[PDB]
Amino acid sequence: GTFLFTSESVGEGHPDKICDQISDAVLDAHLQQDPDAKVACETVAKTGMILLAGEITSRAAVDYQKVVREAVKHIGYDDSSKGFDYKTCNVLVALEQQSPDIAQGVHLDRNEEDIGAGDQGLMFGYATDETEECMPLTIVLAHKLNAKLAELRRNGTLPWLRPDSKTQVTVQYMQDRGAVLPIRVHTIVISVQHDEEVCLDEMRDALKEKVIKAVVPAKYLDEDTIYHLQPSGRFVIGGPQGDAGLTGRKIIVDTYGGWGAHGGGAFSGKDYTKVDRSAAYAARWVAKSLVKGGLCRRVLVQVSYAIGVSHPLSISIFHYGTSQKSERELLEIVKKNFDLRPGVIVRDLDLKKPIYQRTAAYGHFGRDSFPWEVPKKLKY
Amino acid sequence: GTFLFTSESVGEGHPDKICDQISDAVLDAHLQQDPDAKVACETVAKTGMILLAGEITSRAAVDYQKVVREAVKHIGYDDSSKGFDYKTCNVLVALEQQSPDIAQGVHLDRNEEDIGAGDQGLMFGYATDETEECMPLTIVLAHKLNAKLAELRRNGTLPWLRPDSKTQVTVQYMQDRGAVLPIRVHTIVISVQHDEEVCLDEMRDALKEKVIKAVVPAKYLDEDTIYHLQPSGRFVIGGPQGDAGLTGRKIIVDTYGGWGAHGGGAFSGKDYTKVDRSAAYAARWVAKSLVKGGLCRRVLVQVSYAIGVSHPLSISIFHYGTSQKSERELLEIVKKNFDLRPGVIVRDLDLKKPIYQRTAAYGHFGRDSFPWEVPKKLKY
Numbered sequence: 001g002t003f004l005f006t007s008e009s010v011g012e013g014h015p016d017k018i019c020d021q022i023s024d025a026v027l028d029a030h031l032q033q034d035p036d037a038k039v040a041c042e043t044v045a046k047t048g049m050i051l052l053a054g055e056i057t058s059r060a061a062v063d064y065q066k067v068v069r070e071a072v073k074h075i076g077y078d079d080s081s082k083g084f085d086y087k088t089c090n091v092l093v094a095l096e097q098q099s100p101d102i103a104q105g106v107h108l109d110r111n112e113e114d115i116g117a118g119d120q121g122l123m124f125g126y127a128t129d130e131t132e133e134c135m136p137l138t139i140v141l142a143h144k145l146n147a148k149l150a151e152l153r154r155n156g157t158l159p160w161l162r163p164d165s166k167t168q169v170t171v172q173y174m175q176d177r178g179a180v181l182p183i184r185v186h187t188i189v190i191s192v193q194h195d196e197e198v199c200l201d202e203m204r205d206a207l208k209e210k211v212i213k214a215v216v217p218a219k220y221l222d223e224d225t226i227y228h229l230q231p232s233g234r235f236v237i238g239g240p241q242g243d244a245g246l247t248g249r250k251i252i253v254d255t256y257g258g259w260g261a262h263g264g265g266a267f268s269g270k271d272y273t274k275v276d277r278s279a280a281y282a283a284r285w286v287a288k289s290l291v292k293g294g295l296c297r298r299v300l301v302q303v304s305y306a307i308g309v310s311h312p313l314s315i316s317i318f319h320y321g322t323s324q325k326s327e328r329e330l331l332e333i334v335k336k337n338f339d340l341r342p343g344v345i346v347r348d349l350d351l352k353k354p355i356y357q358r359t360a361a362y363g364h365f366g367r368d369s370f371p372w373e374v375p376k377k378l379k380y
Numbered sequence: 381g382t383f384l385f386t387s388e389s390v391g392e393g394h395p396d397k398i399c400d401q402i403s404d405a406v407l408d409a410h411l412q413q414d415p416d417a418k419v420a421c422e423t424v425a426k427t428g429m430i431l432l433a434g435e436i437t438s439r440a441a442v443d444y445q446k447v448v449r450e451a452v453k454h455i456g457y458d459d460s461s462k463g464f465d466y467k468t469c470n471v472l473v474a475l476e477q478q479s480p481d482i483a484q485g486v487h488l489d490r491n492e493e494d495i496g497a498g499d500q501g502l503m504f505g506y507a508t509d510e511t512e513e514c515m516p517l518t519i520v521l522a523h524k525l526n527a528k529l530a531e532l533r534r535n536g537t538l539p540w541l542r543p544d545s546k547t548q549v550t551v552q553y554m555q556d557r558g559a560v561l562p563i564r565v566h567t568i569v570i571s572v573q574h575d576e577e578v579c580l581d582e583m584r585d586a587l588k589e590k591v592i593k594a595v596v597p598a599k600y601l602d603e604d605t606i607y608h609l610q611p612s613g614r615f616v617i618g619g620p621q622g623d624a625g626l627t628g629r630k631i632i633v634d635t636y637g638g639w640g641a642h643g644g645g646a647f648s649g650k651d652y653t654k655v656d657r658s659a660a661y662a663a664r665w666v667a668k669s670l671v672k673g674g675l676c677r678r679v680l681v682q683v684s685y686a687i688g689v690s691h692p693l694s695i696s697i698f699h700y701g702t703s704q705k706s707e708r709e710l711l712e713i714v715k716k717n718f719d720l721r722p723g724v725i726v727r728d729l730d731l732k733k734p735i736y737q738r739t740a741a742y743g744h745f746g747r748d749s750f751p752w753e754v755p756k757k758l759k760y
């Protein structure tokens with residue numbers, strides 16, 4: 001019954017993640033002034049460049065140069081020696097208004113509760129009782145390893161660290177009537193950008209002793225655990241200089257690390273009318289409510305929409321065999337307890353609030369008691 | 381036992397798909413001259429602009445202006461009245477060499493069979509016996525609806541059609557010991573860019589009669605099927621002008637439409653050393669070989685890698701209860717029959733061949749008998 005499963009995460013300075021954080025900094029800047037801003041902000045990052053491309057219709061007056069540079073400063077790219085500098089990079093803007101054809105079909109002259117979905121699409125939510133936060137252990141550990149690197153970089157413990165990092169955790173699991181039980185950590189990968197002076201042995205020793213041991217419980221690590229620490233051997237060039245980044249290129253790191261499923265839509269840079277984000281948050285909320293409500297040990301929820309139509313076209317449930325109730329019965333409970341129209345989700349989950357930049361690194365789920373993380377008490 | 385499931389697809393002129401096709405046109409142009417080119421080409425598309433950003437180290441001499449414009453011409457954006465024109469758009473290039481730190485860790489001075497993975501990551505393959513091509517019916521139908529639109533646009537049957545389109549199909553399924561059996565089509569969405577002159581009723585009638593009925597077997601359609609045809613009411617502005625596109629933003633349309641799982645990696649614009657593509661193709665090959673070999677009715681395969689390491693770190697199998705063999709036994713058969721090192725996959729799947737632009741619309745799987753679609757005869 002044992003099997004392996006692997007998930008990854010990336011740090012705040014990974015170039016794709018930089019783009020997600022900038023897109024969400026732009027969204028938050030608009031929402032701070034105009035709660036009804038229509039935002040679809042894509043970011044591209046390459047050596048010396050941040051480009052904003054997309055569509056925004058808003059009453060806000062946003063200084064894009066300032067917002068982008070402040071987000072890059074927070075990440076830690078503040079000197080040409082690190083490969084990128086917020087003070088001196090190029091910020092290019094190619095932002096236009098939202099298409100009037102989309103606006104008229106989605107939200108113009110519509111009652112807010114009856115606003116149409118901002119696009120068609122499918123979205124999934126997932127939850128698992130294997131951790132208290134209802135997330136897979138593989139991705140929780142991978143995110144915590146990146147957070148630990150950023151913490152040790154920022155506190156000056158490991159001053160050779162730079163912001164760009166990736167981690168990957170393989171866990172050996174057992175299964176119990178469809179539920180999954182972590183046994184041990186089989187393999188860990190960590191790659192992190194570093195300065196020119198530190199040697200490979202110093203980095204590998206620090207990654208094991210100060211990063212892994214500070215994050216992963218000793219009970220999961222044993223003589224057989226495999227460690228791939230700085231496996232490329234050299235990672236001085238990093239950030240956008242090493243690899244072009246784009247918004248919405250870490251959608252599995254943003255969600256469930258290979259567990260569950262994904263409908264394809266990116267989250268960052270989008271206001272609530274874009275169901276790629278709002279309905280995925282609501283689907284997580286449903287899945288977590290079913291698990292915390294004791295109806296399932298783990299569950300996957302699909303929802304789908306048509307552009308301009310408020311009610312979902314379909315809702316579906318997959319409980320992996322972890323409920324005494326059928327998936328048909330769980331779907332009936334979901335339909336009695338939730339209303340997944342985007343104009344209702346916005347109210348339930350407070351989606352006009354400018355908290356989006358906080359979601360754009362370390363996963364959107366299983367952290368900080370955001371509204372989609374607070375289970376709904378179910379009536380049935 | 382019945383349930384709904386939804387998948388989507390997009391047309392060749394959808395802005396994200398334009399980027400995937402251009403990225404793969406660039407990759408093919410390099411491979412035509414240098415089979416060992418190292419390519420990581422991202423494309424961004426917005427009103428009047430194609431930007432190439434990324435990393436290429438190659439002996440090829442490629443005229444990016446010509447390659448990009450020819451790809452856009454093929455798609456059909458050839459006049460400002462359509463919102464985009466290959467003859468007059470801006471083509472900007474921000475391409476640098478591959479990082480020497482990545483090159484030394486991955487492939488420099490390595491025997492080809494022993495080349496390291498070009499990055500860490502996880503990848504999935506999936507196959508289902510519900511169609512002869514071993515793909516989910518939801519996504520097969522969604523892709524065929526977009527292909528039908530392009531066919532009727534190109535043959536002048538529906539001259540008001542423009543290249544940008546999206547489709548979405550919800551199927552009602554039954555299940556039989558973990559396998560899935562399509563019963564009927566519950567809902568279809570089609571949105572397609574159109575000229576200023578055609579009216580909504582003419583378009584909705586043509587979409588039902590000339591598109592849906594030409595694609596979806598009548599046995600799946602009934603008096604209850606729901607049709608959302610041009611649900612936004614107006615879609616004159618389209619292509620990059622309506623929505624910024626980026627490479628690798630349709631990863632679920634490229635794969636299994638919500639079925640199975642995804643590791644997050646994009647396919648287009650990447651040579652074989654980027655396991656995001658090559659190992660996902662090999663994982664599809666494994667899954668399809670298990671199903672066509674009669675071992676499973678449907679199966680999901682995970683594989684993962686560390687940058688610079690040739691052998692996968694993990695391989696895992698999930699058969700949804702559709703085999704008499706345990707997942708442990710199927711994993712043993714996979715390990716006896718396949719070698720998922722990238723330097724072996726390249727040989728098995730002929731991944732230096734410049735056929736990638738053909739994969740970049742209508743899904744990478746279940747079409748054209750590409751090498752990953754030809755099952756391997758299994759020995760056990």
Ligand SMILES: C[S@@+](CC[C@H](N)C(=O)[O-])C[C@H]1O[C@@H](n2cnc3c(N)ncnc32)[C@H](O)[C@@H]1O
Nearest residue numbers: 014191232234235242243420435478481482499
């Ligand atoms: C390996 S690069 C992707 C492939 C790359 N575009 C190429 O040209 O080969 C993907 C991510 O890995 C990390 N990375 C960059 N350089 C690296 C290095 N020298 N060693 C390890 N990881 C690296 C960064 O997080 C980067 O965004």
Ligand SMILES: C[S@@+](CC[C@H](N)C(=O)[O-])C[C@H]1O[C@@H](n2cnc3c(N)ncnc32)[C@H](O)[C@@H]1O
Nearest residue numbers: 040055098101102119394571612614615622623
């Ligand atoms: C609806 S747009 C995404 C949201 C958009 N970025 C915004 O500013 O609201 C996503 C895709 O839907 C399609 N689309 C564009 N305009 C549309 C319209 N008027 N009606 C229906 N679909 C449309 C195109 O394929 C486009 O790439």
Ligand SMILES: CN(C)c1nc(=O)n(CCO)c2cc(Cl)ccc12
Nearest residue numbers: 258259260641680681682696697698
């Ligand atoms: C309980 N087991 C055996 C798994 N449970 C899942 O939920 N999935 C699906 C992950 O999306 C698996 C996917 C693979 Cl490749 C292997 C194992 C599993």
Ligand SMILES: CN(C)c1nc(=O)n(CCO)c2cc(Cl)ccc12
Nearest residue numbers: 261300301302316317318638639640
């Ligand atoms: C057989 N059934 C009931 C399903 N089979 C799957 O393979 N999955 C997982 C899709 O990734 C489902 C996912 C949902 Cl949300 C609903 C149903 C199913």
